[PDB]
Design a protein around this ligand. Structure first.
Ligand SMILES: c1ccc(SCCN2CCOCC2)cc1
Ligand SMILES: c1ccc(SCCN2CCOCC2)cc1
Lengths: 304, 304
């Protein structure tokens, strides 16, 4: 029993982290096979970052300008290319610790683990969610760029995020591993404001199911609702609309607990309208939205 | 910027996890050098667990009754001994992935990472604290016993916890790596009730400092207090007494922020007396106590 905000074990990703230096900028890269992936802004001076022309800055860079260090050993760069907002540095050595892997682009509401790194060395691992406004709420200091977000399926690491920047509001923006930003963000030091940070409703419902499975049940009420009625309440409270696809994904948790999805929606509706009245659910005084239905099943069933 | 509940990177510990089976009981062991450490209740039938005599049960066990599997490869057991509530299985092979390590016994209020494992395979990593009642609030299903808690200092893993049992209240109890339980708990299926789960005051103050460093400052007030006055409030709210040792440990955070420790105590006093009034601090609607002063400095400074 118990329910914790749990990250994937980080060892497979730890084995992939390297330091990339270009001139005076050092950040992190991801070494998979004979390619090192890193944010393209590694080529920028803090001056360049106000309005960088990346193609023009890169003309001034040779293979030997990218210094790649894996532990205390230098890798030989034998090619480089820019794919969207990432650089791919071809090295002469395949990473011997390369796990089975994929590159995936996640949808808002999806959770993943971040291995926060500095100078190619891991500092910590935490769980977070792609917010509906395509930001994440991370913990990143200068030097953390190129840190990655991932999910694991048994022995296959799916990489979904590489860290690139902090908005003036202290929320985080980044790319998939093909270098495409999540949301409308660009790798430039400009005014970039995030949109509404709505609550990920299907994840709150998943976590309420986790609560019931773990014996936190005070919030279960006598009511039900409809998807349309619930959705009127969701819109009022800046919650994401609930779809039938979300209802279907919650089916296994509904089945385990015997609480119909729409009844749990009616419990959620009362919590929104009434507040928690100083009570907690799974040690939280707010409704947690960074567990997916898949996360709750995985944790509640003990998948390795 | 940002502040996350962050676990240590788990790779060094992942390399140490093995499956231990005795008869029909499978749980996790920790393989360091040529010794595998696991809970002694691996020798018990669910029947034995009501009133086990471990010395008598162990007489019936030979080296060949302990099946130790590291990945898909069997280890040869060449000796076994019982140290308090752990078994030490001597194997014929030193773990080649043995990190630099220590065994430490932590104090209540200290935080550590747990690598939750099943059948010797890692499922997840999370951060938690030794509660003042010597329980922890984990996420452990059947088969998770022998999962370990640890801290890392650069390249040295300090192991502080091995998981042994769940109390009837769904909180967790375990040992240090010499097999001594934290608190008064025993490895028997009996009535064992936990004492008061007080709040770890020095950790709340550390997290309020983290909040100020990260720009969450609404709760800063115009007041100060004394250690005696604060402590009268702490006792009323089931907070641990604050000592001058705690004040001294908060000194670096006081210095960074320019907020005297006793002024932050006065802010905490007002939050206790007034509540949060529907506001949040670092995305929490309650006062978080599972970050130590050392954790806040580590995260806020980017140690690897
Ligand atoms: C993010 C990162 C990688 C992928 S793999 C599919 C992408 N393709 C395949 C390779 O050419 C470019 C487009 C998906 C999402
Ligand atoms: C917990 C686990 C191990 C230690 S090392 C010091 C313990 N000693 C040394 C070995 O003999 C038994 C006593 C400390 C706390």
């Amino acid at each position: 029993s118990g329910f914790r905000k749990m990250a994937f074990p980080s060892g497979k990703v730890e084995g992939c982290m390297v330091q990339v230096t270009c001139g005076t900028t050092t950040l992190n890269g991801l070494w998979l096979d004979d390619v090192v992936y890193c944010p393209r802004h590694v080529i920028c001076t803090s001056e360049d970052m106000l309005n960088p022309n990346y193609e023009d800055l890169l003309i001034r860079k040779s293979n030997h300008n990218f210094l790649v260090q894996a532990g205390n050993v230098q890798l030989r760069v034998i090619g480089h290319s820019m794919q969207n907002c990432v650089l791919k540095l071809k090295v002469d050595t395949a990473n011997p610790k390369t796990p089975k892997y994929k590159f995936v682009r996640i949808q808002p509401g999806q959770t993943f683990s971040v291995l926060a790194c500095y100078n190619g060395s891991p500092s910590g691992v935490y769980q977070c969610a792609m917010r509906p406004n395509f930001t994440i709420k991370g913990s990143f200091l200068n030097g953390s760029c190129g840190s990655v977000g991932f999910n694991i399926d048994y022995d296959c690491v799916s990489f979904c995020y590489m860290h690139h920047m902090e908005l003036p509001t202290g929320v985080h923006a980044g790319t998939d591993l093909e270098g495409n930003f999540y949301g409308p963000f660009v790798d430039r030091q400009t005014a970039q404001a995030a949109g509404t940070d709505t609550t990920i409703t299907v994840n709150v419902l998943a976590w309420l199911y986790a609560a019931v499975i773990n014996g936190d049940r005070w919030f279960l009420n006598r009511f039900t609702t409809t998807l349309n009625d619930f959705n009127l309440v969701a819109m009022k409270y800046n919650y994401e609309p609930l779809t039938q696809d979300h209802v279907d994904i919650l089916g296994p948790l509904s089945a385990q607990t015997g609480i119909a999805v729409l009844d749990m929606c009616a419990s959620l509706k009362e919590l929104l309208q009434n507040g928690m009245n100083g009570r907690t659910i799974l040690g939280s005084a707010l409704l947690e939205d960074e567990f997916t239905p898949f996360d709750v099943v995985r944790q509640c069933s003990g998948v390795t």
